[PDB]
Amino acid sequence: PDEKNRITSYGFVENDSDLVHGLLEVQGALVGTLLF
Amino acid sequence: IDTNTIRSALHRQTWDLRSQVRSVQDHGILFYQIGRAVAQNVLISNCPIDPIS
């Protein structure tokens, strides 16, 4: 479909995105093998 | 005290009773819950999972 059946703006998707962004910020601020 | 008694004692504490009971009507949120719970169980085996509904 033209993205017709997406479930925008409900409960835990925003929380998952926020948690992923926070984990990425923590990982990128603590760099200063595992990562290429 | 069996494990089902503990499970039912936990469910009465971490769940809110509600009148006018309704369920999800477009599945795909269920797929999101299923995939997230599976990835939580297999990868992070030191954290519990609240029952899916």
Place this chain on the structure above:
Amino acid sequence: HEAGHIVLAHLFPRFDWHAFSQLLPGGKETAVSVFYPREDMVDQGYTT
């Protein structure tokens, strides 16, 4: 303008209920249409 709004509102399989549309409400040089969302969308809690 409101005829176009009404035509496109009633050209869809599942739209909000059109209660009434009124031209020139109370002397103001405008118009108002009233649409009530269906109960299933209110009971859902999310939008597509």
Place this chain on the structure above:
Amino acid sequence: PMETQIISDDTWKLVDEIWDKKVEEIKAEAVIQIEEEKKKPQILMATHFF
């Protein structure tokens, strides 16, 4: 495009490993969990006295 490869190919091996360990643990846990022979009281503990 300018971004070359990211985290690893070995970290994918490790996450495949832990996935397989958990799958095998669940598989073992499902079928050999319940087997009981007896639970008899050990009230003739002779190694203390006899």
Place this chain on the structure above:
Amino acid sequence: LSNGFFRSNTRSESYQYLSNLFISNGTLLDRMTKTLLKKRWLFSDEMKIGFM
């Protein structure tokens, strides 16, 4: 903001690996979401039983 394209590709590889892993275990998620569909609640015991 020169640090907005590294995280996007990191999440992209995470999504690609997750898709490649979920493709092989598609039947697992299928039977699992069907079990959630019939039985309205799903605990860890049913979870591990349905992992078969």
Place this chain on the structure above:
Amino acid sequence: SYKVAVLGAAGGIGQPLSLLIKMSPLVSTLHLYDIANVKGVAADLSHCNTPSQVRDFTGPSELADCLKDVNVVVIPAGVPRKPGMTRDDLFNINANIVKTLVEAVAENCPNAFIHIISNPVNSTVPIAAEVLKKKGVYDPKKLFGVTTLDVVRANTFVSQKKNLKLIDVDVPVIGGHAGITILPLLSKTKPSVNFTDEEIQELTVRIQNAGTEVVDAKAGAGSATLSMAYAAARFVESSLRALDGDGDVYECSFVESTLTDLPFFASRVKIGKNGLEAVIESDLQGLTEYEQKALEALKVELKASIDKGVAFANKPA
């Protein structure tokens, strides 16, 4: 701020390679040369809105003016195949041309990254080395054999087979640049993918015979031109980046290496400011039995090719 001089820039290879070199962001002066029909190529390139300057020279007499202060010298000169020509006449003509060009480079400017492109490169790099040796100015660290088309073809075939991210696919290729000399180290392909025996054999023979496939696909119209120009431009940009002090310039090339008993070999090397900086020996460690037996099969014929090259390069005048 570097200068590249292409010797033979008006052939089949000369024009696309010059076009790719002109609009690369590293070159600033481009000294094309050919014995004829080089003015038109320079006039064509001078109209492009790229800051690198193009100058052209005609005849060997202007050769002394062509190589002054040149940082990278590329020699793709050589007549393509004509009907009725055996290997003897074509080899003699190409080797005489490359001998004269290497003599001119040694006389004028010997401190340039020399990229030998003419075929066969297995028997041409030793000729250039022997000619540079006769003037007492030979530098083995600044003499390369462009055999990266085999790497490009290996990457293409591996990506087409395994459906892998092409921006990540790279395949080590050792040996030479003609036929069964090409040993694609398919077990060291990054990222990690596992092949079957039939897939390994099919990929190996396809990589080894892709040159013949692209020659006979033209129905006698010549050899590979666009992909060879692609590989030549890739190696030129990599060498120019090595001249700029980049510390991760790893490229596959045919150079004078001590990895085997052969004087010259094609392997992965690390190029620095002063030319060759390191030779990666781990490409020869950990090979499977198929790659090992292919290596010992190609070693004798590679030795024969190098011996033929040094035998011609020491012929009396």
Place this chain on the structure above:
Amino acid sequence: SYKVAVLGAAGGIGQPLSLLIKMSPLVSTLHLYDIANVKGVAADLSHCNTPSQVRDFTGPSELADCLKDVNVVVIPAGVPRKPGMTRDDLFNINANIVKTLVEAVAENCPNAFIHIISNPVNSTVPIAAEVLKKKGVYDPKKLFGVTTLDVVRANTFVSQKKNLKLIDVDVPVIGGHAGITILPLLSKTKPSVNFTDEEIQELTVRIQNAGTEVVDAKAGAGSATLSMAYAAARFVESSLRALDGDGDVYECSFVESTLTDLPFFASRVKIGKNGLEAVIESDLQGLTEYEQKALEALKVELKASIDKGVAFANKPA
């Protein structure tokens, strides 16, 4: 994820244009077409490790297979000038070839960005428009004349003369693509630099006679090869950028415009998702007296060329 089909990709201009399109990060499928010797170019291109795919078709019977689902049609086909041949026979040959190709495109893919490179484009774009009109499917918003070569030459000449940054200099060019029908708007050059009178005259005559300079520098070897390939690749990439929804794709092209009394004109236009989106008329506002008399002198010959084109395009069969 866009598809480009080149009709005539085995000629002089076709092979470098096909190679440069292969290097573009926007093309995903490249369809080479020519009546002969088109499989060699495809074999050359397929060895490169670029994600875009190259397929070849030979003969008119495969032309219906060449243009299925093609998003950009590129027509550089046409035999270059031969000694002893006047304008009439070469015009007839090129016009017949482009007429057959435009008929094939109209039958197969009317909704493709049509880029005409065959010379002269002043008398070729009207022929294509008339052929598309006869099928009742003509779209003036999706028919372009690639005249980016004059812009590139003007930028290069201005950068060489006034010594600016070649990256930043852009010169608008109006009129046509042949002879004195090219009018470089040198008073609107960005960044702003003021010229003298003789400098304006010299730059104007150099831009107008760069074509004869580059075809007489080759000494009868043909026309330019790399420069129009460069310009066509630039125009194709710009059209593909505009097709993705980019809202700042402004390019100089020869299209059906209403700026003057002429039906077709070369001006700066803004391309959108549905083809031509806007025509910049401010290029004709604020002109100096010299550009005004140059425009009024070139209008008569441009009208004559367009009249000759539409006269040939409606000849009986």
Place this chain on the structure above:
Amino acid sequence: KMKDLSPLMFEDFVKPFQINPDDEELLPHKDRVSYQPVDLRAAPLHRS
């Protein structure tokens, strides 16, 4: 007034994606995630 005039009807945009509860069958997937990484930066400029 929409009844006897036969307008041109639209398609349904808010049709829900649902799963058959007890129908034992393997519903398919395409084979991918539809997400694309955002990575757009120009090539380094000339004269460097």
